[PDB]
């Protein structure tokens, strides 16, 4: 019925950027536009995470994929359309599309987390909220 944890990707500096918030009713789909952190960046590495912590290293890695062939441009210029989709079965599909070329790549996360594991993660996020925000502040929608 609901997404037990927020689902997002890593933005520059290892920042957790959530596309689907914890407790969102499913099926659900959210889209955000991202960009490159470096000049003439030829690709973006999409790193899929689940959890409530501000930094991705403190959340659970679900999977990674690369989107290559980004045409040369200054940092912050390319437009990468990222869509997180949860179907009726609770399965997550993540797609990244380069708006200039139309090139897309995707990953489907399979469940081949218990109530206590989810509760531990939510509680830990509440306990370390300040340390987490300090780390986030020092390091917007740019991807590496």
Swiss-Prot record:
The disulfide bridges present are none
Q: Tell me which residues bear Omega-N-methylarginine.
A: 75
Q: Where is this region: Substrate-binding domain (SBD)?
A: 1-112
Inducing stimuli = By heat shock.
Q: Which compartments does it reside in?
A: Cytoplasm; Nucleus; Cytoplasm, Cytoskeleton, Microtubule organizing center, Centrosome; Secreted
Summarize the PTM comment. Acetylation enhances its chaperone activity and also determines whether it will function as a chaperone for protein refolding or degradation by controlling its binding to co-chaperones HOPX and STUB1. The acetylated form and the non-acetylated form bind to HOPX and STUB1 respectively. Acetylation also protects cells against various types of cellular stress.
Which range is the signal sequence, renumbered to this chain?
A: none
According to the UniProt entry, which disease involves this protein?
Answer: In certain aggressive cases of activated B cell-like diffuse large B-cell lymphoma (ABC-DLBCL), plays a role in the cytoplasmic sequestration of misfolded N-terminal mutated PRDM1 proteins, promotes their association with SYNV1/HRD1 and degradation through the SYNV1-proteasome pathway. HSPA1A inhibition restores PRDM1 nuclear localization and transcriptional activity in lymphoma cell lines and suppresses growth in xenografts.
Record remark: domains: The N-terminal nucleotide binding domain (NBD) (also known as the ATPase domain) is responsible for binding and hydrolyzing ATP. The C-terminal substrate-binding domain (SBD) (also known as peptide-binding domain) binds to the client/substrate proteins. The two domains are allosterically coupled so that, when ATP is bound to the NBD, the SBD binds relatively weakly to clients. When ADP is bound in the NBD, a conformational change enhances the affinity of the SBD for client proteins.
Write the protein's name.
Heat shock 70 kDa protein 1A
Q: Which stretch of the full-length chain is present here?
A: 395 to 543 of 641
């Amino acid at each position: 019925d609901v997404a037990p944890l927020s689902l997002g990707l890593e933005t520059a500096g290892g920042v957790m950027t959530a596309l689907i918030k914890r407790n969102s009713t499913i099926p659900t789909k959210q889209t955000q536009i991202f960009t490159t952190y470096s000049d003439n960046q030829p690709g973006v590495l999409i790193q899929v995470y689940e959890g409530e912590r501000a930094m991705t290293k403190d959340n659970n890695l679900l999977g990674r994929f690369e989107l290559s062939g980004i045409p040369p441009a200054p940092r912050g210029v390319p437009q990468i359309e990222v869509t997180f989709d949860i179907d009726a079965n609770g399965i997550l599909n993540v797609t990244a599309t380069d708006k200039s070329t139309g090139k897309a790549n995707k990953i489907t996360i399979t469940n081949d987390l218990s109530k206590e594991e989810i509760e531990r993660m939510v509680q830990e996020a509440e306990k370390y909220k300040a340390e987490d925000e300090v780390q986030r502040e020092r390091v917007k929608n740019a991807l590496e």
